[PDB]
């Protein structure tokens, strides 16, 4: 299937409290594998996945130098944007970037990314054609014109189609065995009620990975979607995820409802119902 290598970078100014906080996180197939955090005496990129410990000292040195370079570049950008937006030097502002490549099974680039945000809002982004830019406001038009003249789009395309794809292959080779990890969900239904003629049936999905999953409630036929409570998928904190979906049903009719769990790791969707303990 498809794979991706993207870096999520953040710079947060802290006027009157020190230098901007700079953090760069690298992800392979949406899994963190390297991290750089300026919050240290001698900041350096660090492995966040065991399979990365394979990279030698020259790799870590090179990436660290590049991160510190980007850090100082973001420091300058923060000041630059204060000018573009005519803002005070006393407030805290944030710049974020998502940079990377998504490649298909054939090894060809499916989509390249190079998007920026200022204070949580889109600023500028490289279009799918990897040739033009989309500026979100007037301040970004300045950067756009600047990057159009500098041929920045061509520089990024070279990285996205070359270096990014190449390193992605390299990382996949070393971590493939780990990245393919799959933990099917273990489900069960709980029964809850307050002194009333209705009851809540809650369908739980636990210990699964990846996080993508679907839970549905069925009444004999048809899918109950209009009145089903659902929580956002959440980390258990040990590498697996959790999720639940609940429905309110008539007291005594619990056996008419069925919960279905859909996961990519399931040879076949799970079907279960409330089972009162012995």
């Amino acid at each position: 299937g498809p794979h991706s290598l993207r870096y999520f970078v953040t710079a947060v100014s802290r006027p009157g409290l020190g230098e901007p906080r700079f953090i760069s996180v690298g992800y392979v197939d949406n899994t963190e594998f390297v991290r750089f955090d300026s919050d240290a005496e001698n900041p350096r990129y660090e492995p966040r996945a065991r399979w990365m410990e394979q990279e030698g000292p020259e790799y870590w040195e090179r990436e660290t130098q590049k991160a510190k370079g980007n850090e100082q570049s973001f420091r300058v950008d923060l000041r630059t944007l204060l000018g573009y937006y005519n803002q005070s030097k006393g407030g805290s502002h944030t710049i974020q970037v998502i940079s990377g490549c998504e490649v298909g099974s054939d090894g060809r680039l499916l989509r390249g990314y190079q998007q920026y945000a200022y204070d949580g809002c889109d600023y500028i982004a490289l279009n799918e054609d990897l040739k033009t830019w989309t500026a979100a406001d007037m301040a970004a038009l300045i950067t756009k014109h600047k990057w159009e003249q500098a041929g920045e789009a061509e520089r990024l395309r070279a990285y996205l189609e070359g270096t990014c794809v190449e390193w992605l292959r390299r990382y996949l080779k070393n971590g493939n065995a780990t990245l393919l990890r799959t933990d099917s969900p273990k489900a069960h239904v709980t029964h809850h009620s307050r002194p009333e003629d209705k009851v809540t049936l809650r369908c739980w999905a636990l210990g699964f990975y990846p996080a993508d999953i679907t839970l549905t409630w069925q009444l004999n036929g048809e899918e109950l979607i209009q009145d089903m409570e659902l929580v956002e998928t959440r980390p258990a904190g040990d590498g697996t995820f959790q999720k639940w979906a609940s429905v309110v049903v008539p007291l005594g009719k619990e056996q008419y409802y069925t919960c279905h769990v859909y996961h990519q790791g399931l040879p076949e969707p799970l079907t279960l119902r409330w089972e009162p303990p012995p």
Partner: peptide, 8 residues
């Protein structure tokens, strides 16, 4: 491997 960013 990350890219070296340009200035805004």
């Amino acid at each position: 491997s990350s890219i070296e960013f340009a200035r805004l």
